[PDB]
Amino acid sequence: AEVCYSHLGCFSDEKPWAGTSQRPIKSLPSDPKKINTRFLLYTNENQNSYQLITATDIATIKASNFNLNRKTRFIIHGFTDSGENSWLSDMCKNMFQVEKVNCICVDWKGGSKAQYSQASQNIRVVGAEVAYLVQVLSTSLNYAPENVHIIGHSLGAHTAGEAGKRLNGLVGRITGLDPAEPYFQDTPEEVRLDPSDAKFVDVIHTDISPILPSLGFGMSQKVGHMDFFPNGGKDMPGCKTGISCNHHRSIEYYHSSILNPEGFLGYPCASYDEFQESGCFPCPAKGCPKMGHFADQYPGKTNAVEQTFFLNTGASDNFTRWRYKVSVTLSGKKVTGHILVSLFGNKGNSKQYEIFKGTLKPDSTHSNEFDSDVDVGDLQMVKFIWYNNVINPTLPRVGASKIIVETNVGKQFNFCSPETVREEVLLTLTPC
Ligand SMILES: [Ca+2]
After folding, report:
1. Is 154 a residue of the active site?
2. From ligand 1's centre to the CA of 158, what distance in Å?
3. Are 74 and 145 in contact (CB under 8 A)?
4. How distant is the alpha carbon of residue 51 from its chain centre?
5. Which of 27, 64, 89, 154 is catalytic?
6. Which of 142, 197, 313, 375 has its CA 20 to 30 A from that of 1?
7. Ligand 1 centroid distance, CA of 291 (Å)
8. Is 338 a catalytic residue?
9. Which residues does 59 contact at the CB level (< 8 Å), separation at least 6?
10. Cα–Cα distance between 57 and 223 in angstroms, integer?
């Protein structure tokens, strides 16, 4: 069965669109009028209240603050959501802090609150609707599609994909924010977001858990030129409660990444396992791409598809983190305890991070990579301190004869100390 809607063309319920193991429920996309896809425009000149624009009346686009010399970014919400939800306009607001842009929020709440299998068909219409607006901008406003970026969350990721496919992959970029898994995982390229849908496609996975039983709203497999897996793409810090928490983290990390690019470097790595075990640090020669808003600044962004990148974030409060590798050479007496290091630089000082916990043998090197909640800057000094999990009555003293700190850029800073301190005493090392 097919339904056809004016200039959006026709839509079928035949495979791979329905009746398959991936998309079992046979259904057709609802009427464009029941879905009522709306375009809410925000510009640097009207940041607080939107301007409504429609593709079928170019006069609306011309009487608005839409600016043909600025890039255009669309934001599409997903399942059960609304284009009028604060996260959309707020993301636009962060953008306005760092650039001049036409920020368009796509409201398709008319079709997002349907049942899943229905909302999944509805995005076919929403996607065609987005593609038509881009088509009119190209055609009537001489605005090139390469100046377009579409950000989509959940079903919105695949919506961006439909729009990109209908625009023949000419869209500048598509960012998938935890693209939905059900009805899309393992479907052909025409159904789901894939590298071919835009010139550059960057994906942030934050809830890749298996829906049944682990309710992982997003998909585990790679769908872009560069797929980022913050915190392994599974259990985001701070999401022990709240059902949509891990799912909504992708929006939060992207939102914060507009103001804090440096706080989210992604490390090329085969897996999170290897990353956690110090095998994907520091950044490669060309640097690490910045997850989020500026991932497009990466030199080799599209030279290959499904490039995986790992990194960790905090649990709230801008989520930003900076990774360092510290190597400690022990001195003093052999005890059993844990050694901690603190970093001091011109920007600030990190907290103390356990490097090793066990048998501290003299002249034995112990490395550990950690994620600092502060970028220290150019390192000035480093502080050591160890604890004995058994106070040996001999008052043993341990020291660090040498401490090497390697930054994400591969730069090593050496620190030396001729002293040894007893348990729980801060030893400050100096440059050497
Ligand atoms: Ca596709």
Report:
1. yes
2. 8
3. no
4. 28
5. 154
6. 197
7. 22
8. no
9. none
10. 35
Q: Positive or negative CA dihedral for 132, 171, 127, 5? A: positive
Q: Which CATH class is domain 322-431?
A: mainly beta
Technique used by the depositors: X-ray
Tokens found for residue 29? 């996309």
Resolution of this model in Å is 2.0
